[PDB]
Amino acid sequence: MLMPKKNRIAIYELLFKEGVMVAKKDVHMPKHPELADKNVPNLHVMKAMQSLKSRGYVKEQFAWRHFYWYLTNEGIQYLRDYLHLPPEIVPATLRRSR
């Protein structure tokens, strides 16, 4: 039983509402630091994003013990299906960044 359903949701809603995630490469930090700190371990974030990456949907970078994960159009579509959202809403990033 890898993750309670509560946790898959609590990762995916954050990744969708922000459009990006960072996580220290730590498998023993008992709580993701402030993001997802409602009893979600750091281990679950990285194991979830691993699967999410192995199927596209995400791009990953790593520097000095920290993963950085970006979303993609395929990932936007998959998460819009998986969390049952209105077919046009995304709070992640929409502005003319002058």
């Binding site: 023993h28 000095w64 013990r65």
Partner: protein, 53 residues
């Protein structure tokens, strides 16, 4: 499962490791660098340590 997954690690070199390479041997702890003696020599110019002795 298990509830035996860590034993007390508050001190000693099992407690601490480099910011960069995550290795345990030859860390510099002065001024709060917390950085391996090899990793430092590599980034010391970015940090601001110049060599003019």
């Amino acid at each position: 499962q298990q509830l035996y997954w860590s034993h007390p690690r508050k001190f000693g070199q099992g407690s601490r490791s480099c910011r960069v390479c995550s290795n345990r041997h030859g860390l510099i702890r002065k001024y709060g660098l917390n950085m391996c003696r090899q990793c430092f020599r590599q980034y010391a110019k970015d940090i601001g340590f110049i060599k003019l002795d």
